[PDB]
Design a protein around this ligand. Sequence first.
Ligand SMILES: CC(C)CCC[C@@H](C)[C@H]1CC[C@H]2[C@@H]3CC=C4C[C@@H](O)CC[C@]4(C)[C@H]3CC[C@]12C
Length: 208
Amino acid sequence: STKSIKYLLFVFNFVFWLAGGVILGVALWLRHPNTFYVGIYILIAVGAVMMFVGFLGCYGAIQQCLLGTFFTCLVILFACEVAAGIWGFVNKDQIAKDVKQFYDQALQQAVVDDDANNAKAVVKTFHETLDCCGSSTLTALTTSVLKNNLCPSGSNIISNLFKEDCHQKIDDLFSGKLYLIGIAAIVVAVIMIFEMILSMVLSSGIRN
Ligand SMILES: CC(C)CCC[C@@H](C)[C@H]1CC[C@H]2[C@@H]3CC=C4C[C@@H](O)CC[C@]4(C)[C@H]3CC[C@]12C
């Protein structure tokens, strides 16, 4: 094949193959009162989908069924994104309250149970991503005074009583910051159609 743009897809999907394997491997590490595990299995499914889809896309450099299956994977994923996009939009508070309950159970097990490497890693990343600590402003104090290894960066104890907690940012992420999720969703939508067109171009180009 003459076109090197077909050769680009191998590197692009191989990134998501390793990312799929890492996300799958990290999700299994977090697996190591079920709502916290309910959110963990979503990461297991996401990590497994990105692995086998990233497998077909990456291994598409070998050049077929393999490539044709990869194109069908992008079509079904695009239709499920539309379904998850419209439904997730109309139920924006349903998943928001579920992210709350996920964060609440993760924070409880991280503070009370000191041997919970999974609960700490989840809440710590939630803290570094949202600049929060504790569920309520009272939980911000209990976490900062006791389990300060969870609060993000060098945030002191006094700085958490005035800052907004995660139960404020989780809602603000879904309410005011829904434009951010819309961007990320469309970004996934435009890279799917871009890989879809480039997949049938590769199939029409590999014919020699
Ligand atoms: C389970 C729901 C509610 C959470 C959202 C899951 C999303 C973020 C996950 C699940 C499946 C994932 C996709 C799986 C396959 C591909 C094709 C690949 O070439 C680019 C990455 C891409 C497009 C992944 C993007 C992220 C993805 C869409």
